[PDB]
Amino acid sequence: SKTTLAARILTKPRSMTVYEGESARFSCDTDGEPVPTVTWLRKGQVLSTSARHQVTTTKYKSTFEISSVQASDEGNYSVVVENSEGKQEAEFTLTIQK
């Protein structure tokens, strides 16, 4: 934080519920200095495109979309967005019933 910011999720990613990897898209706008950071995780070994999920990020706003789930991604998923000194997060359940 060259100036004096940190990490604050201006907006988080809503939740959803599908039978598998239909096409649920999400996005959380997080600000911070010089740039914030987003780490999706809850119970799927770092959501970070592990293999069944596919996340991504830009600068002050990350995004997570699911369409590859197999049979162990469960629903409840979250995102601990933080930065050089901030430490915030968000939550949303993305189930994949069958």
Cβ–Cβ under 8 Å, residues 30 and 20: no
Domain of 83 in residue numbering reads as: 1-98
How many structural domains compose the chain?
A: 1
Report the alpha-carbon distance of residue 64 to residue 73 in Å, rounded. Answer: 14
Report the alpha-carbon distance of residue 1 to residue 50 in Å, rounded. Answer: 29
The coordinates were experimentally obtained by NMR
Burial of 95 from C-beta contacts in 10 A (0-12 / 13-18 / 19+): middle
Report the alpha-carbon distance of residue 28 to residue 13 in Å, rounded. Answer: 5
Q: What CATH number has the domain bearing residue 14? A: 2.60.40.10
Strands 24-25 and 61-66: antiparallel
